[PDB]
Amino acid sequence: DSVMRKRKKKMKKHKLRKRRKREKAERRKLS
Amino acid sequence: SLVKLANTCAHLQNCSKVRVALTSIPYTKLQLQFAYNLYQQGFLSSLQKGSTMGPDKDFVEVTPDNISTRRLWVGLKYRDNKPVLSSCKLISKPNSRIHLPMEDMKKLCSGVTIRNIKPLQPGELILVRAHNNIMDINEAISKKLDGEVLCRVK
Amino acid sequence: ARQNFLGLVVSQGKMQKTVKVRVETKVFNKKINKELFHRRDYLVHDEGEISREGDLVRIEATRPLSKRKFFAIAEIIRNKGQQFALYESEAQLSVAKEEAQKAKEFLDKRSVRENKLNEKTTLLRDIRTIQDALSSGSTPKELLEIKQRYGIQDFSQETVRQLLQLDISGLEVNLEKQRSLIDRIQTRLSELLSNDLKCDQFLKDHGVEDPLTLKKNIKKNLLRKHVMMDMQQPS
Amino acid sequence: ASTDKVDPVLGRADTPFITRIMAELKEPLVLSKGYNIEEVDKFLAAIESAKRERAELSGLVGIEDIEKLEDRREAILRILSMRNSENKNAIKMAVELARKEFERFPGDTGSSEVQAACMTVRIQNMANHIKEHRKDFANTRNLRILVQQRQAILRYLKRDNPEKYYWTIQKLGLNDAAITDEFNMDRRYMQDYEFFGD
Amino acid sequence: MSQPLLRNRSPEESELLKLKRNYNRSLLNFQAHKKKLNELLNLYHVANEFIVT
Amino acid sequence: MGSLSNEKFFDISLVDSYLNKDLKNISNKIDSKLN
Amino acid sequence: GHIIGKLVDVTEQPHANNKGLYKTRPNSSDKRVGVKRLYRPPKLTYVEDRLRS
RNA sequence: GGAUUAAAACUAGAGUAGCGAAACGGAUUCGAUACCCGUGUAGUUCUAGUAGUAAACUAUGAAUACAAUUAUUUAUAUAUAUAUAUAUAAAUAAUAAAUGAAAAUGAAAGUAUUCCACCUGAAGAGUACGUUAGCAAUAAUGAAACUCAAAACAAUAGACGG
Ligand SMILES: [K+]
Ligand SMILES: [K+]
Ligand SMILES: [K+]
Ligand SMILES: [Mg+2]
Ligand SMILES: [Mg+2]
Ligand SMILES: [Mg+2]
Ligand SMILES: [Mg+2]
Ligand SMILES: [Mg+2]
Ligand SMILES: [Mg+2]
Ligand SMILES: [Mg+2]
Ligand SMILES: [Mg+2]
Ligand SMILES: [Mg+2]
Ligand SMILES: [Mg+2]
Ligand SMILES: [Mg+2]
Ligand SMILES: [Mg+2]
Ligand SMILES: [Mg+2]
Ligand SMILES: [Mg+2]
């Protein structure tokens, strides 16, 4: 796939990583 | 070996595309029978026993001492800027062998697709092996023989 | 008649009077348009417990003998499985004997080398006394001892030459004899074949009946068998 | 747990064939490069004797002191000592010894029994290397492939000549299970047979 | 086509073949053995220059 | 020259002729000829 | 006048070679197909060319 | 199934010059959580492990048989009027034929054969759930619903380019 199409997967991976960092943080405070 | 026969079928197609007058094939009983059938049917100009370096001019007895260096040399025919032997393909493949009764061979020669084998076309040669002998399908039907459908030459 | 199958014993000695036999049958697979072999393992009754893993056997249908047993061994077509068991037992005994013999030949060789290391006398020095005593006339008792260290009772110039002989020398002469034989056999047959008249006579002289009426290959083999019977039997 | 667990790489411990070949390589006067001391002592004595005879035909600096000729012998035996040569030379001698104990006839080097024996010698040497170089993965891969190659040659032997097969594996210290069973020389094997010790 | 594809070696031909092949293996072993002795001789000639004491 | 060589550093020919009774069977032959 | 396409069989080399060994089996070169030599334009050579140089 | 597997990361014990996430400062800027500069913690190093992921790419699985040329190296062999010449292989470059959507491939992406892996519109999604493994980060396995008649590749002529 071209760079243009790769960029869509890049955004999805970024948002998943951002959400998992956010979830981690919560667990630390709630723990 | 059907693998060796597949190699020879592909080799002859390659030689026809470049229009070489003479080429060599492995020296085995099956190859010799295959080549002889093509020669009698007018696909090959010549059929000579020989060595890796070329056809033998004088008879050279084949023994274990020289068996590894033996080859069969065949002459290809070209008329009107067209190869006489244009295509050569196996029907019965190493990983899927096809054995047909004489009744089904008659259907194949009559225009009926049997076991996905496209029927015999005008001017095409289909060879059959029965009891380690290679013959034309029309000849196998005459002798009431059942056998493996090996290849089709056009 | 009762349905009979051929198969290879794939398990034995795990159940009492029961063996597992692998039967392969030929079927047509319409989807891929190919005649395939279909495999199935059968639990089979072995009344005499004769079959062994690896054997080729014929199994015959029988009455129900158990929940899963409906066939019995009817004949051992090939007994490769039984052979394996016999050869394994023999191997243990055969190898033990050979290893014992080789262990005794190794300790003996060690002893001989150790004994020689206890004799300070060296070949060079000993060969320098047999060549000085033989050139000076002195006969110290060392020579008598040397006549025992080597067994050379007589001390002459042709005794030191036989103490220092190297195997390579013998090999060089055996190789020349081998080369001669091959060369002679080839020249003889080559010449014989060139002259049909001398060939026909050659065969008759060696006891062939009407050699003239023979083929090239049927007669050249006779010539070869004779030329190799006139250069290897007489020598 | 009662199964006969024979190490598929090194075979049964104390195998007489493996031990005897190893001992032969460590004997006091073993020489490298195909020389044997007995042939070298006669050859060196022949040179001296031959020189004297050549000096008694065309002859009429005296002779060398024996101590000097003994030092020339000591230099030749130190240069040709197996204990002063590379380990590969010792393995070459072992391969010859193993081949002659398994050959069907003089010159037989391709029979499956001979090939297995020759592979055994190299496997034993390579296994010793790995035990001292446990992080040398390149040569561990070579060992695995070599062990698997020995399995393949012996499996064919079992099919071709069953009697020889059982004799060969017994002499090499292996068992039928070691040959037939799939072997990957994986980490569990290195721990179940204590390949590296501790 | 009628000619046989292969003619097996006669027992005599196999005997001569074995003689030549055994000779070839023996000659090579002998030549290597003699080469080694010739190198041992050339090393003896120079061992007077080597130090062991 | 081979066995009948004058070089201080000779070849295996000399040692072979010695153990093959050639350097001796020629020395006697030459001496017998001189006689 | 050199012949192209002729293979010398081991049966035609009964005597030993310059190395002292007999030939008992085909070598690797003998086992390679040489069809290409049949089609490559032959290199014309003349003895007079050597004298001219 | 097994083994090995960049960088980052992690578990212990050392090391820590230089470099350098982060953090704290200096600038730039309409603003500058950046680009540039400073101080520079983890890390980068070694030893013993965990983990098995990369645009881990030639984006091209492995094996066998075969097909027209040239050039350039390399290797082996042969010859001599001894330094070249003649042979046979390998590699690389440019090609014929053939193949292909074309770009191109070129001894394969050609002519054939054998075996394995994998794919079946886009998005949702390599996500959710479950399971397995790991100290952990995570890795592997891996959907469906809803929605849409899209979505993608090569090439062509333009327009534009700090
Ligand atoms: K029962
Ligand atoms: K640091
Ligand atoms: K694969
Ligand atoms: Mg893609
Ligand atoms: Mg293998
Ligand atoms: Mg790197
Ligand atoms: Mg740390
Ligand atoms: Mg800042
Ligand atoms: Mg600011
Ligand atoms: Mg900074
Ligand atoms: Mg690991
Ligand atoms: Mg990941
Ligand atoms: Mg991946
Ligand atoms: Mg890379
Ligand atoms: Mg391979
Ligand atoms: Mg995941
Ligand atoms: Mg595009």
Question: Read out DSSP for D167-192?
Answer: HHHHHHT--HHHHHS-----HHHHHH
As given in the structure block, the two tokens for residue B124 are: 């095409």
Backbone angles phi, psi at D94, to 5 degrees: -60, -40
The answer to whether the beta carbons of residues B27 and B36 sit under 8 Å apart is no
Q: What is the DSSP string of G7-46?
A: ---GGG--S--TTS----S--TGGGS--HHHHHSPP----
Spacing, Cα A15 to ligand 17 middle (Å)? 29
Contact E42 F9 (CB under 8 A): yes
Q: Does G27 touch chain E (CB under 8 A)?
A: no
Residue G36 CB-density burial (10 A; 0-12 exposed, 13-18 middle, 19+ buried) = exposed
As given in the structure block, the two tokens for residue D87 are: 């380990």
Smallest Cα distance from F9 to chain D, Å = 11
Smallest Cα distance from C201 to chain G, Å = 25
Q: Does B60 touch chain E (CB under 8 A)?
A: no
Q: Which residues have CB less than 5 Å away from ligand 1 (the ion)?
A: C 66
Given CA atoms C153, C154, C160, C164 in this order, what sign does their dihedral have? negative
Which chain B residues are Cβ-neighbours of E8 within 8 angstroms?
63-64
Q: Which nucleotide is nearest to D140 (CA to C1')?
A: H3
| Cβ neighbours around D6 below 10 Å, total | 20
In angstroms, the CA D60 to CA D47 distance is 19
Smallest Cα distance from E47 to chain D, Å = 5
In angstroms, the CA C189 to CA C206 distance is 14
Secondary structure class of D133 (helix, strand, coil): coil
Sequence-separated contacts (24+) of C31-35 with Cβ below 8 Å? C32/B96, C33/B96, C33/B115, C33/B116, C34/B95, C34/B96, C35/B97, C35/B99
- The residue with tokens 């065969």 is C203
Q: Which positions 23-42 of B are in contact with G (Cβ < 8 Å)? A: 23-24
**Looking at chain B, how many residues does it have?**
154
Q: What is the resolution of this structure in A?
A: 2.9
Tell me which amino acid residue D125 is: N
In angstroms, the CA D195 to CA B6 distance is 49
Mutate to test the interface with F, among E34, E41, E42, E45 (most CBs of F within 10 A): E41
Q: Strand H: which bases are under 7 Å from protein Cβ?
A: 1-5, 48, 55, 59, 64-69, 81, 86-89, 96-98, 110-115, 123-128, 137-138, 152-154
Nearest in space to B49 (alpha carbons), one of E4, C159, E44: E4
CB proximity list for B87: less than 8 A, separation 6 or greater:
B13, B153, B154
In angstroms, the CA B72 to CA B51 distance is 8
Angle between helix axes D87-102 and D16-25 (nearest 10 degrees) is 140
Q: Does B70 touch chain G (CB under 8 A)?
A: no
Tell me which amino acid residue G31 is: K
Q: DSSP state, B117?
A: B
| Cβ neighbours around C133 below 10 Å, total | 16
In angstroms, the CA C23 to CA C41 distance is 6
Helices (H), chain D: 16-25, 37-54, 66-79, 87-102, 112-132, 137-160, 162-172, 176-180, 187-192
Tell me which amino acid residue D76 is: I
Bridge-based pairing state of the strands B99-100 and C4-15: unpaired
Distances (CA, A) of G11 to B4, B16, C179, E11: 28, 35, 17, 16
Q: Does B64 touch chain E (CB under 8 A)?
A: yes
Rg of the Cα atoms in chain D: 23
- The residue with tokens 């190789």 is C175
Residue C46 CB-density burial (10 A; 0-12 exposed, 13-18 middle, 19+ buried) = buried
Backbone angles phi, psi at C105, to 5 degrees: -75, -20
Of C168, C182, C217, the CB nearest to E19: C182
In angstroms, the CA B37 to CA A2 distance is 55
Alpha carbons within 13 angstroms on the beta-carbon side of residue C204 total 10
| Cβ neighbours around B14 below 10 Å, total | 10
Distances (CA, A) of D177 to C96, D98, D151, D166, D180: 20, 23, 10, 12, 5
Smallest Cα distance from E32 to chain D, Å = 10
Instruction: Name every residue in E having a CB less than 8 A away from some CB of G.
Output: 17, 20-21, 23-24, 27-28, 31
Contact C186 G16 (CB under 8 A): no
Contact C179 G15 (CB under 8 A): no
In angstroms, the CA B16 to CA B83 distance is 6
Distances (CA, A) of D51 to D78, E8, F3: 24, 56, 10
Tell if G36 CB is < 7 Å from nucleic strand H. Answer: yes
CB proximity list for B96: less than 8 A, separation 6 or greater:
C32, C33, C34
Which chain E residues are Cβ-neighbours of D71 within 8 angstroms?
47, 52-53
